[PDB]
Design a protein around this ligand. Sequence first.
Ligand SMILES: CCOC(=O)c1ncn2c1CN(C)C(=O)c1cc(N=[N+]=[N-])ccc1-2
Ligand SMILES: CCOC(=O)c1ncn2c1CN(C)C(=O)c1cc(N=[N+]=[N-])ccc1-2
Ligand SMILES: CCOC(=O)c1ncn2c1CN(C)C(=O)c1cc(N=[N+]=[N-])ccc1-2
Ligand SMILES: CCOC(=O)c1ncn2c1CN(C)C(=O)c1cc(N=[N+]=[N-])ccc1-2
Ligand SMILES: CCOC(=O)c1ncn2c1CN(C)C(=O)c1cc(N=[N+]=[N-])ccc1-2
Ligand SMILES: *[C@@H]1O[C@H](CO)[C@@H](O)[C@H](O)[C@H]1NC(C)=O
Ligand SMILES: *[C@@H]1O[C@H](CO)[C@@H](O)[C@H](O)[C@H]1NC(C)=O
Ligand SMILES: *[C@@H]1O[C@H](CO)[C@@H](O)[C@H](O)[C@H]1NC(C)=O
Ligand SMILES: *[C@@H]1O[C@H](CO)[C@@H](O)[C@H](O)[C@H]1NC(C)=O
Ligand SMILES: *[C@@H]1O[C@H](CO)[C@@H](O)[C@H](O)[C@H]1NC(C)=O
Lengths: 336, 336, 336, 336, 336
Amino acid sequence: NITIFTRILDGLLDGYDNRLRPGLGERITQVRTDMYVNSFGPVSDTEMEYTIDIFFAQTWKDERLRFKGPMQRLPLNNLLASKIWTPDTFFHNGKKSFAHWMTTPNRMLRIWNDGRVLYTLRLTISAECPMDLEDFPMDEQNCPLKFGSYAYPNSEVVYVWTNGSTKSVVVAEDGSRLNQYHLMGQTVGTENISTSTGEYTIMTAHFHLKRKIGYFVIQTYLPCIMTVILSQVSFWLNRESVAARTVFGVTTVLTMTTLSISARNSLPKVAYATAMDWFIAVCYAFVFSALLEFAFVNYITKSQPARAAKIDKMSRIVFPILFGTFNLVYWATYLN
Amino acid sequence: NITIFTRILDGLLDGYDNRLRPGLGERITQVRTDMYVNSFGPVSDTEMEYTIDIFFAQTWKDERLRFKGPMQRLPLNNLLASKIWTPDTFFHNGKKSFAHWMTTPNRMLRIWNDGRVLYTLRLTISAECPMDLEDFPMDEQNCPLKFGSYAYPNSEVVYVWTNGSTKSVVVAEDGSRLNQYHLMGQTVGTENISTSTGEYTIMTAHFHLKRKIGYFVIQTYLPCIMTVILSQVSFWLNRESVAARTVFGVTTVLTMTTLSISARNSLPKVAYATAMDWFIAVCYAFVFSALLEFAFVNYITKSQPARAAKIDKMSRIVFPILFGTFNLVYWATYLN
Amino acid sequence: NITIFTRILDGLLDGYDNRLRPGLGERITQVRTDMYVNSFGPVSDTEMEYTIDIFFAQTWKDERLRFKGPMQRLPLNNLLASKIWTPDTFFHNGKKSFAHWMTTPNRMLRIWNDGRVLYTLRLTISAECPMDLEDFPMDEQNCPLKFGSYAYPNSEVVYVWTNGSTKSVVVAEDGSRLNQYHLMGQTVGTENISTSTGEYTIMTAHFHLKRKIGYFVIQTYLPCIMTVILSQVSFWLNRESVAARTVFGVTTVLTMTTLSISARNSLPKVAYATAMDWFIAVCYAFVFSALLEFAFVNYITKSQPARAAKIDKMSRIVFPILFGTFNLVYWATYLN
Amino acid sequence: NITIFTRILDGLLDGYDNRLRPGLGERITQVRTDMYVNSFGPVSDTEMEYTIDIFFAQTWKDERLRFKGPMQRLPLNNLLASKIWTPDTFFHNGKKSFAHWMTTPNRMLRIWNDGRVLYTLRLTISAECPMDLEDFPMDEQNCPLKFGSYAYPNSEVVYVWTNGSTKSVVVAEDGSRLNQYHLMGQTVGTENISTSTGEYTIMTAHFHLKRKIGYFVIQTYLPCIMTVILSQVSFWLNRESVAARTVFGVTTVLTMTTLSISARNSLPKVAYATAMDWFIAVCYAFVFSALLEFAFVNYITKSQPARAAKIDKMSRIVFPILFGTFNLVYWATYLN
Amino acid sequence: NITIFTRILDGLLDGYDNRLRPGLGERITQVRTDMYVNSFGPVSDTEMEYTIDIFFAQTWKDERLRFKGPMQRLPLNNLLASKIWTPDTFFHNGKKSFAHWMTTPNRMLRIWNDGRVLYTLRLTISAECPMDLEDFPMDEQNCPLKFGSYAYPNSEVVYVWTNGSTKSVVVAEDGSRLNQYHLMGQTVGTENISTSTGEYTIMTAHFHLKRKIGYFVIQTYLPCIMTVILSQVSFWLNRESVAARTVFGVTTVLTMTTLSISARNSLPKVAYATAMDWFIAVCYAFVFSALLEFAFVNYITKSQPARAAKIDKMSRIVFPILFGTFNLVYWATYLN
Ligand SMILES: CCOC(=O)c1ncn2c1CN(C)C(=O)c1cc(N=[N+]=[N-])ccc1-2
Ligand SMILES: CCOC(=O)c1ncn2c1CN(C)C(=O)c1cc(N=[N+]=[N-])ccc1-2
Ligand SMILES: CCOC(=O)c1ncn2c1CN(C)C(=O)c1cc(N=[N+]=[N-])ccc1-2
Ligand SMILES: CCOC(=O)c1ncn2c1CN(C)C(=O)c1cc(N=[N+]=[N-])ccc1-2
Ligand SMILES: CCOC(=O)c1ncn2c1CN(C)C(=O)c1cc(N=[N+]=[N-])ccc1-2
Ligand SMILES: *[C@@H]1O[C@H](CO)[C@@H](O)[C@H](O)[C@H]1NC(C)=O
Ligand SMILES: *[C@@H]1O[C@H](CO)[C@@H](O)[C@H](O)[C@H]1NC(C)=O
Ligand SMILES: *[C@@H]1O[C@H](CO)[C@@H](O)[C@H](O)[C@H]1NC(C)=O
Ligand SMILES: *[C@@H]1O[C@H](CO)[C@@H](O)[C@H](O)[C@H]1NC(C)=O
Ligand SMILES: *[C@@H]1O[C@H](CO)[C@@H](O)[C@H](O)[C@H]1NC(C)=O
């Protein structure tokens, strides 16, 4: 009962040319594609790339593979994949993509009586995701995934998503786990690109990313906020304690200087100011301004002591108010 | 006496199709799997992955390989593995798995008279282990290992553990050696997952990990604890020594600030607070509060000196007590 | 209607030797090359290399592939590429180049009736780009890309750009995105190099890079500029406050020392001074000079107090003026 | 005179099955193994692995390769290695081993008239070397190297070292060069391991490593030793100089805190205390104790000045003596 | 006119055994080798290795390839390389060598009428270069490059440089570009090594490297030199300013401590003192000695004030002189 299957496979491969697409010179080969994202790998902001592991499935019609037998389907493995024609699908934005080979090349091939072919493959794509880090860390990113035929233009091979967008792309519940991003959702679309080699239909999948704040709050904002509060303590010390207040201003100013350097070490070396940079810059101004207030106060503490005391007393109220007011504007401006 | 073995191998391969599973169209192929963990590689918390080296063994029945001869078994090597049918087993959560090829592809194939086939393979699997670092470093992790057929659904190929759970998975005594984890034990199970390509039986092995503390005690807790004690020394200095006590508060506050930054550099950039973060935050409050006490004491040291001395004297007792009390609650809360 | 294509391919490969170039012993094989830069990868200054992803296309004439049929063109894939002769093009300056294999080897082959052959390939070239970092960060770089035949000298195979320079090399709008460089434009050229193995025509493409400033302003210049301003605040403090002014000078001098070390950590370990180094050196002189002024002032504050006050008062004006004057000369000198 | 060699090779391969070991069903195949360590690569303490490059040679007897000819030996290359049977030797503890392929696969095959076969191979083995870092840096390590057959149990293939232990394993004079280890010597042995797949003879080579001190002396011990001496200088300052002595204690205590953090960055994250950790801990106690002495002295400098001076004077002698005494015990305890 | 070439290639391969070296059993195969260094890659001091990209050319005589035809030479590509015999040349000290495969395997094969064969190959060799860093950074290194036959002893295959040493090895003008080394020149030689597998002729090429100073001057020496000068400023302050002079000594001593740690981070972890270490150690003594002078001066400032002033005044002259004198001896000793 098993020899029958062997004959069917031999018959289909008899006189079959894998170098020619099905329907050549007769029609346009239509390929239906569906994707299942097993795991949405890490998003490297420094390299502007993200890693994704998917089960890429392609379906098409091949009349040369029609057969008759007791079983309506022929489950198979990677062995027969090379013997038949498969689309030369490639990822336009994929910088480096490699397949999984252990324990066996993770490929499946299924053939029906009518000649319909299902060919799914497991891939780990490392694509490029350009980002505009102007609102960082309150930034949203849209990482795309573009793929299509490499050699067959739109007039020969056409890719279309199967069913609706929701069914076309599926993300596992545990797969969408990132340390500094929320996977809000996914969208799909199609487009035609005109090239010197001809028109090619492009299948694009966009992943919406919402950066999750809380790591930078514990890493950058809080040390900056507490450092500013530390500087304001100097206003509560006597003017004659010149050395004591000097330590506050000098240490706080340098503390903010190193925080700015440390903060940008993890951030990509982008040549523009981000939202976090402005927050640090303002905090640096507050600590620096406090030192200037002491220097000005200590400069006139002898000629006009009366005004020096008033400035020091007033600074105890103005500085906390302005810093608190700035945060409300800053957080409300970006958290909206 | 050696030519007989050659004839047997030629006969079995004569008319044998490796593209068809044994028992096709007649029964369901049953595969018995056993695992031996040679070494439980490092667990990368930053990348949420772990590396494991195993001797993956699969056993199944193939009537096409039945033979008669003086020897009841036919030990072999990787040469004949490709000539026969083998299950397309793959690791669902395996991000990157590679085989060992030196000196020779580490594969063994054994065939008995009845047709039973033993096919073991050495692998180095780099799987993903999601972790909830809310109780870090007093956290327990359960890293799984899922594998199954890629192309053959549950109706064609079924995986079952051999004998009990203990015999199914074995870990070498020297293999289970990690720098920051204890391998408490292992558990195995089976489940069926419904997919668009059909139902597939999933074989899962869970490794229980108990993070071992002591590195963070020497790295984070002790510097934080001693820094807090250092700040409390300021309470034993005279109020008029404004500069001396200012150095204590400023240096200690900044010392805790850098410790928080340094501590999280090794920790994954998770957007939530861990148990260690709370300990650092409380320690930061103690050192910061001590500086505020001096500022308040130095602010009223002239108008009401009597109360200033009492506060300074009282702080010498309250601060050590509260810090010690906090540790007992903190350690008892998590070490239980 | 599909069997006709199979016969044509069989006929062309019948009696075809892929080890012999077309026109051997009769003429010189002319290859027309065009390039499309999908993405201009990162430029590693430390390793003096850059990564580029391109669609490398080669066109040549092969009379052995002439055919007659209803279709004037024969779109194909990588399968037939190995069966025919292709140029042994290689990148002379390419340190490490790898092809893309997923989902299918990204190669296309097209053949016309006259025998013209189009063979395009996707590549990721990691070439070496020597740089003279004397005006860093106000430096312009010209990273080349040289390629040609490895085995066929100029007398056998010749490479020529197709159409003009603009059409020969094309860069995608989104591809030319670098964190610290502007892709001003591209230029192409040809040359002959004499070697022991014969003369070889070299096709060269030069990419003009204009480093974008703004990251170093936020990372190096601003901390240095503010540190210098911080030191000058000491001039506004009383001479008798010896400890207070000592903290300013010591902290600022050490702050500049660490900034110089930190700044060069990212910069390649070049054994010469850059423009940024001179800026840091001058800033170090200003902060160091301020401390010397205090030491000199504090040294004569008793013998001749009158001159000490004048020097301190005068320094409040001279130092800000010189530092501001230096910046105008420095920025104007390099920003021109 | 060269055609004779061609006939001999053809005759031996005629009717030769490479899937069957020599002497199958007649005797036990004996393999003689010798090793030459070209270079003992770096030992990664963090990853508990070491890299070694060797010339692995295996010798065995194969009666199927007997031949008669003018030349008693048949030097060859990797071409014939795949055509005959070779042992499936593998490294049990080898985490990742790769062969050398340039310029040609570095394999040699030699055959004698009697059928003796010599098959040597060049390998770069990255094995795992567990270490107990309790006496670090005064620790000795014994990195093993285990290898044997993967598919042939002890009843079919047996490995034995050739000649004595000294000749069996040889290390090049320049190969044994490590930055932080001394290669004292090598030892070899054999053992049988019982496994579910049968008994396998294991050939083990142990490399004795003696960590060389001097890098940690310049990196950790000396800064710690000088820091302690720096703290003791405070005892020679007047009590009334409260700020001056406070700077000594605060700076020294924090200096030791960062040294402990910095020292363990290179060290593996082991969850136990090493010898260096105890040395740092004691040094931290000395600097911390000195600050406590000043605080206690400054606390009673008014009520009982007489005792305060005596304590300060006495501390100038006790502290240097105890620190010196501790070092003699510490160094003698571990350097013995 | 092209079919003639096809017949010649078929005739040569007819009855040709690639497993036998030319002249086997009749003479000794002589191989002439020439090298062209396209680029001398980076020299990794930490890993004691260097990377080099070369065009490795080998020439030998093979009477089996003699042919008669209109063309005196047969330019070819990698296709025919595997069909004929080529030497099994390998690099003895090569830790990891890989070939270039894009766009086509960069191999050339040329055959003349007499049977002379030219076979050149492009390689990227990562060899090991042991270094004695005793005079670092004033150290000279001699990185070798050893290669020879793997399977054919000196009695079968012999390697000889072609023409003189200068022509045998050539380095491109732009190839010899290193960030911290000068390529003074190259030398070549030959030697015979006796091994258990027989005598093998070794072809060695030595590259003379002269480390270029200037990065460490800007990174290590200058901060150390200026730090020492900073400490000497304390001698110009009044003795009663105890806190002011304490800050100078404490900050400078700790500044030198961190510089020593930072400097050795890039340097390999060698267990011996380098020239830079001695310079840092002396600088540490000067800053430390200055603090001791203040402590001694402040200790006797009351009992014998007259001597205290003289010591402080004298130290202003002695310390600068000794430090300047040391540099002249240090620089002259190593820069000679
Ligand atoms: C420079 C001459 O062209 C080429 O060498 C070439 N080679 C491939 N391709 C091209 C053309 N091009 C720039 C492509 O972006 C390209 C896009 C496609 N669509 N998809 N998915 C499919 C193929 C494409
Ligand atoms: C998107 C269409 O599907 C695919 O392309 C596909 N390709 C493989 N597989 C699938 C289906 N799927 C999502 C799988 O998770 C899958 C699980 C399995 N069980 N195991 N072990 C076995 C195979 C599976
Ligand atoms: C040392 C003997 O030569 C060789 O072994 C060798 N092998 C290849 N090549 C050479 C010669 N040479 C130094 C090359 O730079 C070279 C340049 C070329 N042009 N392109 N593009 C093409 C080929 C070249
Ligand atoms: C889980 C069922 O077993 C296996 O799958 C398997 N596969 C290989 N091997 C084994 C058995 N085992 C645990 C091995 O440690 C093993 C050791 C050997 N000796 N050597 N050198 C040789 C082979 C071995
Ligand atoms: C342990 C038994 O030997 C071997 O297994 C072996 N295998 C190769 N080789 C050897 C011998 N040996 C130690 C080599 O250093 C060796 C050097 C050579 N010359 N070159 N270039 C050529 C070959 C060499
Ligand atoms: C692409 O081309 C096809 C040609 O049939 C057309 O139907 C389709 O609408 C085009 N898509 C877009 C986005 O223009
Ligand atoms: C999976 O399916 C099989 C079908 O025979 C069933 O026997 C088994 O109980 C199922 N397993 C689970 C966990 O439901
Ligand atoms: C290279 O050689 C060819 C030989 O025909 C010549 O036409 C061309 O001008 C040469 N190119 C250069 C740059 O000299
Ligand atoms: C291993 O088994 C063989 C069986 O012949 C025996 O001779 C040998 O002594 C055993 N080795 C050990 C270490 O027990
Ligand atoms: C190596 O051996 C050959 C044998 O002919 C000899 O001619 C040559 O001089 C030897 N080389 C050295 C360096 O001894």
